[PDB]
């Protein structure tokens, strides 16, 4: 028995602090979000299935506005997410205050990675047990996954949470950097179908995107999403036939 995950201040003898690698597991038991980044903009698609129908269709939320050109989604605790999404929005706007530049997706990511590392280092506070996806267009669409540890990983298309591993493998084959907005949105939607181990329901998923040619953040409308979802359900069905 262990004591390398009793508090964060202890390294295991293997060399690695286990307790922040156990905040990673916090994500895993939580529920999926996929970000699919193309050269037409970036897309972000995230769980809203959660719980019974006692709950409203808008189980707020996984799709946070971070600015007007940056969005983020999460997997992990939606408790721990809520404060981190506050910090993420205030930080982004502070950049706007002290520079008048729409924050670059890269620089935001780097600050939220530094803020987690505050919690990782100090033992008077536990790690964040939340992972974040930050998707934006600063002038080049860029997509990152921010780890519990305060770590930075760039992806072409990404997942976290329940479906993570299956999505990784679905995009391992099909994803290429060249796929249209229409293709990328539907492809990530098939992959999402797999993550929830059922056909999509267009009211169980919430989807935003940041476009290059607008440079604006927009939320896909319930019925505007519906034909995209329709063509994804055919494929989702095929693969659960096997």
């Amino acid at each position: 028995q262990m004591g390398y995950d009793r508090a964060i201040t202890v390294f295991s003898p293997d060399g690695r602090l286990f307790q922040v690698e156990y905040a990673r597991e916090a994500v895993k038991r939580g529920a999926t979000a996929i970000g699919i980044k193309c050269k037409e903009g970036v897309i972000l698609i995230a769980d809203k299935r959660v719980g019974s129908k006692l709950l409203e269709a808008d189980t707020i939320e996984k799709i946070y506005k971070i600015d007007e050109h940056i969005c983020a989604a999460t997997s992990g605790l939606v408790a721990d997410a809520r404060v981190l999404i506050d910090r993420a929005r205030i930080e982004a706007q502070i950049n706007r205050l002290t520079y008048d530049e729409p924050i670059t997706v890269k620089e935001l990511a780097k600050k939220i990675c530094d803020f987690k590392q505050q919690y990782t280092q100090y033992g008077g506070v536990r790690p964040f047990g939340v992972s974040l996806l930050i998707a934006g267009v600063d002038e080049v669409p860029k997509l990152y996954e921010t780890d519990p540890s305060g770590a930075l990983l760039e992806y072409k298309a990404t997942a976290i949470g329940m479906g993570r591993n299956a999505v990784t493998e679905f995009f391992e084959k099909e994803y290429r950097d060249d796929l249209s907005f229409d293709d990328a949105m539907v492809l990530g939607l098939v992959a999402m179908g797999l993550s929830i181990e059922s056909e999509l329901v267009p009211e169980n998923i919430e989807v935003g995107y940041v476009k290059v040619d607008d440079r604006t953040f927009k939320e896909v409308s319930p019925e505007e999403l519906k034909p995209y979802v329709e063509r994804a359900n055919e494929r989702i069905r095929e693969l659960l036939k096997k």
């Binding site: 916090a26 038991r29 939580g30 529920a31 959660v50 719980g51 992990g76 605790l77 939606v78 329940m162």
Partner: peptide, 9 residues
């Protein structure tokens, strides 16, 4: 495996 809340989602 286990456990999706509630608060873990």
């Amino acid at each position: 495996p286990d456990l999706k809340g509630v608060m873990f989602v």
